[PDB]
Coordinates of C-alpha atoms and ligand atoms in Angstrom, one line a residue:
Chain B
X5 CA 8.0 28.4 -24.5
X6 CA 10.3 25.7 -25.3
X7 CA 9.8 22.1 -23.3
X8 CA 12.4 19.6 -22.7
X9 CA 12.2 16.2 -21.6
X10 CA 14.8 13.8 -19.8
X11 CA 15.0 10.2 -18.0
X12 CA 16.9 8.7 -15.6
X13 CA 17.6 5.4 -14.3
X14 CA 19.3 4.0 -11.6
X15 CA 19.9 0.4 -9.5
X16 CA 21.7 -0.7 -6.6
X17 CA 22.5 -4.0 -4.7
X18 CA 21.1 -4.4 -1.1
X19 CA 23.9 -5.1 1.3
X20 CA 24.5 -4.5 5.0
X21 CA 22.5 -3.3 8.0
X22 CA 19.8 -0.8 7.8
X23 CA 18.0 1.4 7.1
X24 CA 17.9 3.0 3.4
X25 CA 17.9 6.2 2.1
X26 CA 14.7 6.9 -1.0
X27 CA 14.2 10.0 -2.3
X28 CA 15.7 11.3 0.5
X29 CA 13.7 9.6 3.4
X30 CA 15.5 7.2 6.0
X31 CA 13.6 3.9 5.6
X32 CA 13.7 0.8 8.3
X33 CA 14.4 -2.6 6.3
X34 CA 16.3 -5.6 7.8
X35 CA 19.6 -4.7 4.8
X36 CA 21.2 -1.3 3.9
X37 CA 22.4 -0.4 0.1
X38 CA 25.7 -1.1 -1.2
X39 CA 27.1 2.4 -2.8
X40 CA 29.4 5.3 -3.2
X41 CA 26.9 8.0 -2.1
X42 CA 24.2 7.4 0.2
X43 CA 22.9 5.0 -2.6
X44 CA 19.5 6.8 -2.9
X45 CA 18.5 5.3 -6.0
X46 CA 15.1 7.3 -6.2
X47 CA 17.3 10.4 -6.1
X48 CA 19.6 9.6 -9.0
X49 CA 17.5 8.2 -11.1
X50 CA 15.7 11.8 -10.5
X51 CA 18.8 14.1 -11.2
X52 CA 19.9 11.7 -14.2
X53 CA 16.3 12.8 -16.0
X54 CA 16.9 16.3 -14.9
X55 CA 20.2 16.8 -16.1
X56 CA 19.7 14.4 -19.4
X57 CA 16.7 17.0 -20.0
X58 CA 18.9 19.8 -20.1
X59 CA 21.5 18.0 -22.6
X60 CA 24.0 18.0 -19.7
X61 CA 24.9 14.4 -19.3
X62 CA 24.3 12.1 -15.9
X63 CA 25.9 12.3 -12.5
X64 CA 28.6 10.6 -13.4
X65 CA 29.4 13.1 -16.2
X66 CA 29.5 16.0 -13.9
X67 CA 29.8 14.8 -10.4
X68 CA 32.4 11.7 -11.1
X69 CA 32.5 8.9 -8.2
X70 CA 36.3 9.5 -9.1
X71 CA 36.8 12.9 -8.9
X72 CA 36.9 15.8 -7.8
X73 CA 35.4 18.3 -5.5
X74 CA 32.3 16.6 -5.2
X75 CA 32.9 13.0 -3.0
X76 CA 31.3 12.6 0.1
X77 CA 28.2 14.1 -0.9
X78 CA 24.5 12.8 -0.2
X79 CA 22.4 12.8 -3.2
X80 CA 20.3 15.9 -1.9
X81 CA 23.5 17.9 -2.2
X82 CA 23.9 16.5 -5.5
X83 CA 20.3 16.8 -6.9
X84 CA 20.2 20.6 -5.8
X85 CA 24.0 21.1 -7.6
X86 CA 22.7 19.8 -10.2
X87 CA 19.5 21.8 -10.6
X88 CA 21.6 25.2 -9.8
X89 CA 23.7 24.2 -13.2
X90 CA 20.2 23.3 -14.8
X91 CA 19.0 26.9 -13.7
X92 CA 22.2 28.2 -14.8
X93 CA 21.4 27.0 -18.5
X94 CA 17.7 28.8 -18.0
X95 CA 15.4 26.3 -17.2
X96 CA 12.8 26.0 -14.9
X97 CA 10.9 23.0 -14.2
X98 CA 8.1 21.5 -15.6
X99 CA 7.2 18.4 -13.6
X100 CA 9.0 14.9 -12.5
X101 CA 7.6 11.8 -12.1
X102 CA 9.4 9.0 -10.5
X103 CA 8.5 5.1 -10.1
X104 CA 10.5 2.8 -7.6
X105 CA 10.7 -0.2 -8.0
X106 CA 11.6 -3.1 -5.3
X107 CA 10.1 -6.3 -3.8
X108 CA 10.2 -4.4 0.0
X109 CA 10.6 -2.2 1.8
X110 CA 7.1 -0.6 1.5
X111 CA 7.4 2.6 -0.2
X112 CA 4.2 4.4 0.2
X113 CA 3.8 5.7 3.4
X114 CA 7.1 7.5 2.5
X115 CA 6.1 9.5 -0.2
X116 CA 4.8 12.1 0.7
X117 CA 7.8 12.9 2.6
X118 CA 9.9 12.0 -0.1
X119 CA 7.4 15.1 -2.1
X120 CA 8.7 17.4 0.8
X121 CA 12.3 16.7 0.2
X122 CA 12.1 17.0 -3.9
X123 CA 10.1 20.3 -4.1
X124 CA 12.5 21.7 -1.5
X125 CA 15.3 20.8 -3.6
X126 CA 13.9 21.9 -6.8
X127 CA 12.2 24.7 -5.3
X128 CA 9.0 24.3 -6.8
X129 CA 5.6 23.3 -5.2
X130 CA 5.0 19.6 -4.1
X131 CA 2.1 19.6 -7.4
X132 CA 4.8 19.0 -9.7
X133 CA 6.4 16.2 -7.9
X134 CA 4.8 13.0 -8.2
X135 CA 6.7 9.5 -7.3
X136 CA 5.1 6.1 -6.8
X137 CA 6.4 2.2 -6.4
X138 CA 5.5 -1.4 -7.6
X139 CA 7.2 -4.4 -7.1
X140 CA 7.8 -7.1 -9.9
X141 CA 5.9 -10.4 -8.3
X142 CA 9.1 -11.9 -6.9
X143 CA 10.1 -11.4 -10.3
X144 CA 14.1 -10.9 -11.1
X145 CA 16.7 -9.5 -9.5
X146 CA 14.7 -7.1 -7.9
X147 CA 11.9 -9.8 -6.8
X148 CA 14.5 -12.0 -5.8
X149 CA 15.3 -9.0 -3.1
X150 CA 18.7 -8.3 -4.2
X151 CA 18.2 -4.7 -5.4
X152 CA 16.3 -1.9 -5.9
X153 CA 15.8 0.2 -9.6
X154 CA 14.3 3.1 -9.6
X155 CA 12.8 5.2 -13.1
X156 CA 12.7 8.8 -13.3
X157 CA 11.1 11.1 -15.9
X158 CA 11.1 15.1 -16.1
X159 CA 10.2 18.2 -18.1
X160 CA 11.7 21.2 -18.4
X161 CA 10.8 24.6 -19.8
X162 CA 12.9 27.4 -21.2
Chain M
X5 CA -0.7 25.6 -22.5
X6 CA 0.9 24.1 -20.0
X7 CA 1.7 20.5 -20.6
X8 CA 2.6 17.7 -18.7
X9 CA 4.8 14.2 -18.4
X10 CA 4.2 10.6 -16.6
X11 CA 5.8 7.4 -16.4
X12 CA 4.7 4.1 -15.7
X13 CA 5.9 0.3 -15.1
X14 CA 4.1 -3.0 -14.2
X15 CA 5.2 -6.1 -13.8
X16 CA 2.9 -10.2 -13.8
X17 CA 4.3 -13.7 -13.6
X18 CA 2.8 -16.3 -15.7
X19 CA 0.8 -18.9 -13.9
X20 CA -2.4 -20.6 -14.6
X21 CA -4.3 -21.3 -17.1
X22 CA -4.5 -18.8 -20.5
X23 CA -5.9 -16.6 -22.0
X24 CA -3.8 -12.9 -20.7
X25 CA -5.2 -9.7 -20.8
X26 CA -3.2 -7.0 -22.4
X27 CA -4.6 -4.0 -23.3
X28 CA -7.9 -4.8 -22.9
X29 CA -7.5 -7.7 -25.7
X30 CA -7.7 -11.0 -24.4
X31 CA -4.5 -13.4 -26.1
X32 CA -4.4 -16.7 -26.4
X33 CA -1.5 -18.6 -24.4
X34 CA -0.4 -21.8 -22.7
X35 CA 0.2 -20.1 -19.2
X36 CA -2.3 -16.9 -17.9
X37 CA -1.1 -14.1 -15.6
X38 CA -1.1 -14.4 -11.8
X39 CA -2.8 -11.2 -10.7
X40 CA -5.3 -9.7 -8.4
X41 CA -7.3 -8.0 -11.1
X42 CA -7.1 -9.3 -14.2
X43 CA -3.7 -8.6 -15.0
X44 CA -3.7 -6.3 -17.2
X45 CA -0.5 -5.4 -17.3
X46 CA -0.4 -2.6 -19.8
X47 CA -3.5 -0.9 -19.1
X48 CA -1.7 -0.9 -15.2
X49 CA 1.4 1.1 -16.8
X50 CA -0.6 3.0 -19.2
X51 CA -3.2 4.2 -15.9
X52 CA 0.4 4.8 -13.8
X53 CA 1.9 7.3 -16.4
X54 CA -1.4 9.2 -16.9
X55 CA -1.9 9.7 -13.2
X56 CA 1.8 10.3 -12.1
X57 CA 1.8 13.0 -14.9
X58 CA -1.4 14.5 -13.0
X59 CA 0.6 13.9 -9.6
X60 CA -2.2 11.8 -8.5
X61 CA 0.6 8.8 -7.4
X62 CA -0.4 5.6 -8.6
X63 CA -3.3 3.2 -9.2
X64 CA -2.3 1.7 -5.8
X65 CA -3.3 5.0 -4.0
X66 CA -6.0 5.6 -5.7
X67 CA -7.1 1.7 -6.0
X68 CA -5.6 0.2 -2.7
X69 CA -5.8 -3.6 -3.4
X70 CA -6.6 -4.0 0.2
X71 CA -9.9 -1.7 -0.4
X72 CA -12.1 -0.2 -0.4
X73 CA -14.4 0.5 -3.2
X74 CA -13.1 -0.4 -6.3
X75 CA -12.3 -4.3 -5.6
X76 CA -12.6 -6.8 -8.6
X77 CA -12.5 -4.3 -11.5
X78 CA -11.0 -5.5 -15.4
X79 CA -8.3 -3.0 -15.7
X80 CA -10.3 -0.7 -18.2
X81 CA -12.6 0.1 -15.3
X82 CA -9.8 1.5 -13.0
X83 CA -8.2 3.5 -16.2
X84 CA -11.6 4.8 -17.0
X85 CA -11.8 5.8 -13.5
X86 CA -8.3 7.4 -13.7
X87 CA -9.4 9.1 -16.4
X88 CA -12.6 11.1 -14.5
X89 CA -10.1 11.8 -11.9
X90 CA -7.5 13.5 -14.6
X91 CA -10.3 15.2 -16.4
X92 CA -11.6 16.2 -13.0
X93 CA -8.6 18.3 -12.4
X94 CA -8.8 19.8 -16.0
X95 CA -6.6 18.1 -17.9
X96 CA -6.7 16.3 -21.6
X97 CA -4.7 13.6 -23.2
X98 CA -1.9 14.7 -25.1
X99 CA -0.6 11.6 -26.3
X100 CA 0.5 7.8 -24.5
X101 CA 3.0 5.4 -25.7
X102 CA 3.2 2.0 -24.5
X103 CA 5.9 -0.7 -24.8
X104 CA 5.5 -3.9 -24.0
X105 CA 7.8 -6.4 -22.6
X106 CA 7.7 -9.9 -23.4
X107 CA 9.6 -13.0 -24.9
X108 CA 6.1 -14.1 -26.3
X109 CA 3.2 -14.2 -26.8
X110 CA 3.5 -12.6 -29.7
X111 CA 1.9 -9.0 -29.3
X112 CA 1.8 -7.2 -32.7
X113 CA -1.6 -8.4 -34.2
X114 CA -3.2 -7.1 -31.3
X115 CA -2.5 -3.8 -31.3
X116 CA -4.8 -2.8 -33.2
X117 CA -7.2 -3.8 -31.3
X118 CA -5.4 -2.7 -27.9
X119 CA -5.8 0.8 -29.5
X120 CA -9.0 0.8 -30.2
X121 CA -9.6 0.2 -26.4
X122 CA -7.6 2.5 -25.5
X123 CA -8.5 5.6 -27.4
X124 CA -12.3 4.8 -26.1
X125 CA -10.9 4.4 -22.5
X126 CA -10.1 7.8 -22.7
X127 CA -12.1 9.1 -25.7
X128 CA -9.8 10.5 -27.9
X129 CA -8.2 10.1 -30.9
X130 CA -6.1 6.6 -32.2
X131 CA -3.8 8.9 -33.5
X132 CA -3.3 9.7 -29.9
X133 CA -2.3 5.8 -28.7
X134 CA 0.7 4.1 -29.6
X135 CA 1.4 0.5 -28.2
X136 CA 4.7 -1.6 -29.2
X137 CA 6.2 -4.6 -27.9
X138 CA 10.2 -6.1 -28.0
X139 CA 11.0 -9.1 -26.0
X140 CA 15.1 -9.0 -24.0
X141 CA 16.6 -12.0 -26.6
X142 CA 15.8 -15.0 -23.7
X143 CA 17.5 -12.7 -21.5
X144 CA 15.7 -11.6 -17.8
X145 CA 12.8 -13.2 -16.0
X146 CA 11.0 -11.8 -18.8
X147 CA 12.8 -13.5 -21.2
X148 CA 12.5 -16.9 -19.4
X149 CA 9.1 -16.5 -19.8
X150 CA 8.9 -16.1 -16.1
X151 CA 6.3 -13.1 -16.7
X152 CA 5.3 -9.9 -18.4
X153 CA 6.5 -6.0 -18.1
X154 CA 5.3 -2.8 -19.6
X155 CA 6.0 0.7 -19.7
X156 CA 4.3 3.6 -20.3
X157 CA 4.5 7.1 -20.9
X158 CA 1.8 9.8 -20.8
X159 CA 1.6 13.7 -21.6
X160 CA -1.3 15.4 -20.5
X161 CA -2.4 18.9 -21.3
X162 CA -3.9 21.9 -19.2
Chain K
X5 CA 2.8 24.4 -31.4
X6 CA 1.7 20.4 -30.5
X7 CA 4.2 18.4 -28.8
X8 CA 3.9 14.5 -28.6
X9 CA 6.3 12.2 -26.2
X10 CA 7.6 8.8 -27.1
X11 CA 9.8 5.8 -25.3
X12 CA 11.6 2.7 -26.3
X13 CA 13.2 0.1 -24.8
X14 CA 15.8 -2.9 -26.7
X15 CA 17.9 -5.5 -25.3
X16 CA 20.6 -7.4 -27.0
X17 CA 22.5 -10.7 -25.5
X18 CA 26.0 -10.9 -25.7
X19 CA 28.0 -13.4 -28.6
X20 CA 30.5 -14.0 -30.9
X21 CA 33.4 -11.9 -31.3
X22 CA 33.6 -7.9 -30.1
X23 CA 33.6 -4.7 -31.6
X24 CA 30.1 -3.9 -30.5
X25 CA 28.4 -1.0 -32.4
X26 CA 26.7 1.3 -29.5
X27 CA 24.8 4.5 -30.8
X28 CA 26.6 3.8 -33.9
X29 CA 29.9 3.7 -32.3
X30 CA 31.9 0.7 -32.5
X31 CA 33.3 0.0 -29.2
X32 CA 35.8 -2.3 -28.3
X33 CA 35.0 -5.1 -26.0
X34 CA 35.5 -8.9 -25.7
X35 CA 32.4 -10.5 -26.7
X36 CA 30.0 -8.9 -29.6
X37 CA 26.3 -8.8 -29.8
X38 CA 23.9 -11.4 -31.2
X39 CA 21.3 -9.7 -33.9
X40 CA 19.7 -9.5 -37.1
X41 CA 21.0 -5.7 -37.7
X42 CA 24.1 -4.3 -36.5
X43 CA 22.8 -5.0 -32.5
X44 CA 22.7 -1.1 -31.9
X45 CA 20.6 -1.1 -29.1
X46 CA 21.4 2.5 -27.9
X47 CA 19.9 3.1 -31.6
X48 CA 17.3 0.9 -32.1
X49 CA 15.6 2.2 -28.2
X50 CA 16.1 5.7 -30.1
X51 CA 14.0 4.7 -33.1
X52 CA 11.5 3.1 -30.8
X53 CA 11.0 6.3 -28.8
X54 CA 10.8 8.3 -32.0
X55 CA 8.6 6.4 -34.3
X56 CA 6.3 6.0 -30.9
X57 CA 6.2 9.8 -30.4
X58 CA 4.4 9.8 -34.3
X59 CA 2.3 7.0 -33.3
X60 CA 3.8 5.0 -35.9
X61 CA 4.2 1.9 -33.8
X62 CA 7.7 0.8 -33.9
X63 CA 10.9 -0.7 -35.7
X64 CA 9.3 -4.4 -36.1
X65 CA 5.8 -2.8 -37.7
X66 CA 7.7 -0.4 -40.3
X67 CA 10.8 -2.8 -41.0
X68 CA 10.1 -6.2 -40.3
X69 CA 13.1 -8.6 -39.5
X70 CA 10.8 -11.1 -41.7
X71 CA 10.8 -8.6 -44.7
X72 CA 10.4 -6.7 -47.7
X73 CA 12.2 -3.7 -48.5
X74 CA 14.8 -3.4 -45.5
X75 CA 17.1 -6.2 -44.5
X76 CA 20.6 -6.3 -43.7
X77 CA 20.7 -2.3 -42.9
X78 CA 22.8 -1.2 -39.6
X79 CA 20.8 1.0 -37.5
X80 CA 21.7 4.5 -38.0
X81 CA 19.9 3.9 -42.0
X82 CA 17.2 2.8 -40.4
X83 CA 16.7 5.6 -37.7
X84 CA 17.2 8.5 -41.0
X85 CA 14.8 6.3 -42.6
X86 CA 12.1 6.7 -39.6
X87 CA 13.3 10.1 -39.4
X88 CA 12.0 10.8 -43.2
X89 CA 8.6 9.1 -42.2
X90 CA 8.0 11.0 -39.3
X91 CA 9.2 14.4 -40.7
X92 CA 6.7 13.0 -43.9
X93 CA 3.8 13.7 -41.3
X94 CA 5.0 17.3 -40.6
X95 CA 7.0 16.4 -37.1
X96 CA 10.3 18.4 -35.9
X97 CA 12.8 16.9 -33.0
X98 CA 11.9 18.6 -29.4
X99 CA 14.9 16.9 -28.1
X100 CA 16.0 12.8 -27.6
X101 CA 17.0 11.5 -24.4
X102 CA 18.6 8.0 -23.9
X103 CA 19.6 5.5 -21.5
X104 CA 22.6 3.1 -21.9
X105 CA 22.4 0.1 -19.2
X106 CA 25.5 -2.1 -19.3
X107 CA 27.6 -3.7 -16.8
X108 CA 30.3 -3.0 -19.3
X109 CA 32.0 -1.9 -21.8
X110 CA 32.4 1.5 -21.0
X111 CA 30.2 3.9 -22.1
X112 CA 31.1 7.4 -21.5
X113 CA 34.6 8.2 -23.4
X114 CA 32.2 7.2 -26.7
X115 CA 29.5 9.0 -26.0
X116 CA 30.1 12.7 -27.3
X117 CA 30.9 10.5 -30.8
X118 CA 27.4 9.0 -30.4
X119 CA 26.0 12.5 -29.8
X120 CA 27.8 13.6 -33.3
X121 CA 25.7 10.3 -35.3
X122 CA 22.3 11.1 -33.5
X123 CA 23.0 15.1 -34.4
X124 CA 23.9 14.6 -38.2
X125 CA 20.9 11.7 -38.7
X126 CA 18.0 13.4 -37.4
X127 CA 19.6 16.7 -38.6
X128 CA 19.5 18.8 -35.2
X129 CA 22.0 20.6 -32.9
X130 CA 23.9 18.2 -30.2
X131 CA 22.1 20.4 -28.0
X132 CA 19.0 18.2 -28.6
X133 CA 20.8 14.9 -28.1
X134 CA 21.7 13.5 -24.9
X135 CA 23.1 10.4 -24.5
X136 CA 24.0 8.0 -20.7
X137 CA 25.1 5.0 -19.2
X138 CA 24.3 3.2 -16.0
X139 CA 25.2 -0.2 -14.7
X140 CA 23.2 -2.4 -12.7
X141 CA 25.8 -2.9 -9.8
X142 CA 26.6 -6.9 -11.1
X143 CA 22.4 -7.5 -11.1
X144 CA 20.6 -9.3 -13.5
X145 CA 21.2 -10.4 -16.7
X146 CA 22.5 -7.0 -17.4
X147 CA 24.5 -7.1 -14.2
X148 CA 25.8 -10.7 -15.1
X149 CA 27.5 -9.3 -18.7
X150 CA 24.9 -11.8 -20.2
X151 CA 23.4 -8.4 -23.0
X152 CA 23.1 -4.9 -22.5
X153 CA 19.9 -3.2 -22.6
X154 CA 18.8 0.9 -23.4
X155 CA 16.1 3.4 -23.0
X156 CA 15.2 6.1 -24.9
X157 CA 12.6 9.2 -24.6
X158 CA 11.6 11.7 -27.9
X159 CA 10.0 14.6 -27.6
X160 CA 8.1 15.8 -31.1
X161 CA 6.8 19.3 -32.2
X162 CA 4.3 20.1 -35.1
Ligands
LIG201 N1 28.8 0.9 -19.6 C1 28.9 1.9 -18.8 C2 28.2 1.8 -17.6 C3 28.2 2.8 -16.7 N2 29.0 3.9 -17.0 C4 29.0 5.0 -15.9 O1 30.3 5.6 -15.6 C5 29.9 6.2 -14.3 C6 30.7 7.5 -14.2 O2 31.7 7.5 -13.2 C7 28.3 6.3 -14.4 O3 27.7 7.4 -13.7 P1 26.6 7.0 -12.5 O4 27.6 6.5 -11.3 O5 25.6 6.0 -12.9 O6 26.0 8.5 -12.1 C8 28.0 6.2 -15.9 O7 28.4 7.3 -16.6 C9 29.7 4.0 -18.2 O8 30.4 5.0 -18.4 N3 29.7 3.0 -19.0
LIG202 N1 8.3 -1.1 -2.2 C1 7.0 -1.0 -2.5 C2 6.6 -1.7 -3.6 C3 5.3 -1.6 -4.1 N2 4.4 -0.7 -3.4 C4 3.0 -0.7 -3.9 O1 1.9 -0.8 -2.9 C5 0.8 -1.2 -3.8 C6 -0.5 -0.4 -3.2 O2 -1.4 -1.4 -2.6 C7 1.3 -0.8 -5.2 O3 0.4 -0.3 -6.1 P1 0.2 -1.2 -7.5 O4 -0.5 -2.6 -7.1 O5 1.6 -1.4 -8.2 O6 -0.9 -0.3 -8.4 C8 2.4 0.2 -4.9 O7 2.0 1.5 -4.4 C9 4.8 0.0 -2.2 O8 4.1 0.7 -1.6 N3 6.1 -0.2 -1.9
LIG203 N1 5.5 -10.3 -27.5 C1 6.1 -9.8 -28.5 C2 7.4 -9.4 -28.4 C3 8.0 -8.8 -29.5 N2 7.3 -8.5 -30.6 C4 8.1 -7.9 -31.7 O1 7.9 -8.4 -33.1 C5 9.0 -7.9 -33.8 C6 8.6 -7.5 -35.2 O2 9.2 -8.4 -36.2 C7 9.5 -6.7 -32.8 O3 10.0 -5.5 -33.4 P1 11.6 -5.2 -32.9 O4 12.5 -6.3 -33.6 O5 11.8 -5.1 -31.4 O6 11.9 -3.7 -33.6 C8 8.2 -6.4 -31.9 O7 7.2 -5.8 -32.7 C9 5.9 -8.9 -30.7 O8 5.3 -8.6 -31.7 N3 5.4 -9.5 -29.6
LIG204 C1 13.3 -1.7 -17.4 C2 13.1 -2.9 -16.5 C3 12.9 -4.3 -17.1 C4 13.0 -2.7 -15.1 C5 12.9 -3.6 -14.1 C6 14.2 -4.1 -13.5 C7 14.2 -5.6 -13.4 C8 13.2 -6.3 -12.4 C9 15.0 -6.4 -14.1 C10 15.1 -7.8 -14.1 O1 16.4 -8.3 -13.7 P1 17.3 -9.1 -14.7 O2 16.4 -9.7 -16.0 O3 18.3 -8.0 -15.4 O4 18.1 -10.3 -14.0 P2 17.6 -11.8 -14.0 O5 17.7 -12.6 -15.2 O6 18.4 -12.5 -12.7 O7 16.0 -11.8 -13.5
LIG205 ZN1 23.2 5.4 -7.9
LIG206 ZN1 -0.4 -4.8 -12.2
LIG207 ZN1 17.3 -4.4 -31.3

């Protein structure tokens, strides 16, 4: 039994109308996210410690904004691509923990929704997915309400 | 054996008068941290990444600052609490590492000491604890000496 | 079989004139950064994450910028030199996982190169090294090009 550990991070600007997209779970907020992909920074930050975990990189090594068969993809598709490779390399999944972190909108009445999503996409059960938010008191760029980060931590087992 | 990862991050602006309280040691400083508890602000992302690696969420579902029975508590009271609730499940403390984030005060003769608290908090080993601090070079709200972060992370055993 | 976790976090502000060194890597780019050391910060969050995993605190408590034994060494001598003390207490690399966050310069043409340094100075495969790069979509003082920060998990067996 060999364990593996990865983490992930990931920010992005707030910009346009609502609502957002968090760990897979449409949220109402008064701006959407500027990005690429659906810009569900929860998400990415996720797949990023996945896939760092399994030595394979980040998104943006395998799934490049660029190119190529891989554009126009939400980042559930992308999360469960990246687990299939993951799998591929024969790992299974430990646990994840994931910590959002934004001034608003209010994250925890989502969560548990957001559990739903992940242990679907990982296939694994909802005990092994664990996400939670803080703010940073007004604090920076993220207290100033311009963004949202998100911070991501897994294990995996071979 | 099957073990198991958590991560944690906290953020308090500086306001009022000093001392802080980090890791349980009280520091002396020319601002204090503006807080609803006492601030604590490595004892916050120390509790975070031992209950996210239990998938337990955070402190602030299992300590709502709004209620309802766990109001004014020093930050070693909600960790020791955490740490029923872990144990509860049957789990023990791997290990925790801690990094602090701040241009100054300067952290490093208090570890020690922030150790010591914390390997009682949880009764187990020092060996167990690690706690270091960097500042970001002048750079960030923390580096304006605009407040304090911390993160933590946590591996627990079953 | 044990295992122990560690993090680490480093920021460096930009100055002076480029090549930047970057996980030992010197990359081109217009501005350098300001430091004591060689400003690896990819390296130096590595080290952290490592030295935290052995509980042995971090870089500023085994090589103080102050003094005695260790000044004016790049990075990579001081991560084999961590690497000695924490194989000294009988640890072996799990795997390292780390975190670039930069605006810019780019990160991922130099990474497999980084891979190749982290590989030969903890003496492991470059299957146990992995190695990414985010931005912070022009936010914050990382978003602003005003230093570039990194984060870095370790996972230890004894
Ligand atoms: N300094 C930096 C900062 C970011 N990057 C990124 O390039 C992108 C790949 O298209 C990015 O992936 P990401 O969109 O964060 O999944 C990271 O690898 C990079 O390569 N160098
Ligand atoms: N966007 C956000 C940001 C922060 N939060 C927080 O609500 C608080 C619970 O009272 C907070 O817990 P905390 O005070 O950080 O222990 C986190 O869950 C939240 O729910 N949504
Ligand atoms: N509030 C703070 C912020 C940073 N520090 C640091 O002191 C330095 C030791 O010379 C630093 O180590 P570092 O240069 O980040 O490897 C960290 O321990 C500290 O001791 N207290
Ligand atoms: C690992 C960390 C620190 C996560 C939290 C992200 C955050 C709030 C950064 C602060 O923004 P900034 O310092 O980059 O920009 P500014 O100087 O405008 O506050
Ligand atoms: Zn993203
Ligand atoms: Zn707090
Ligand atoms: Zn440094």
């Amino acid at each position: 039994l060999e364990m593996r550990i990865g983490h992930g991070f990931d920010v992005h600007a707030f910009g346009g109308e609502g609502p957002i997209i968090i760990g897979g779970v449409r949220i109402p907020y008064e701006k959407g996210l500027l990005a690429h992909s659906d810009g569900d920074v929860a998400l990415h930050a996720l797949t990023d410690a996945l896939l760092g975990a399994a030595a394979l990189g980040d998104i943006g090594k395998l799934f490049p904004d660029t190119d190529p068969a891989f554009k126009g993809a939400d980042s559930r598709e992308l999360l469960r691509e990246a687990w299939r490779r993951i799998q591929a390399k024969g790992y299974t999944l430990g646990n994840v923990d994931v910590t959002i972190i934004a001034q608003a909108p209010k994250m925890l009445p989502h969560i548990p929704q957001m559990r739903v999503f992940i242990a679907e996409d990982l296939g694994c059960h909802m005990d092994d997915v664990n996400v939670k938010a803080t703010t940073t008191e007004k604090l920076g760029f993220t207290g100033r309400g311009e963004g949202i980060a998100c911070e991501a931590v897994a294990l995996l087992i071979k």
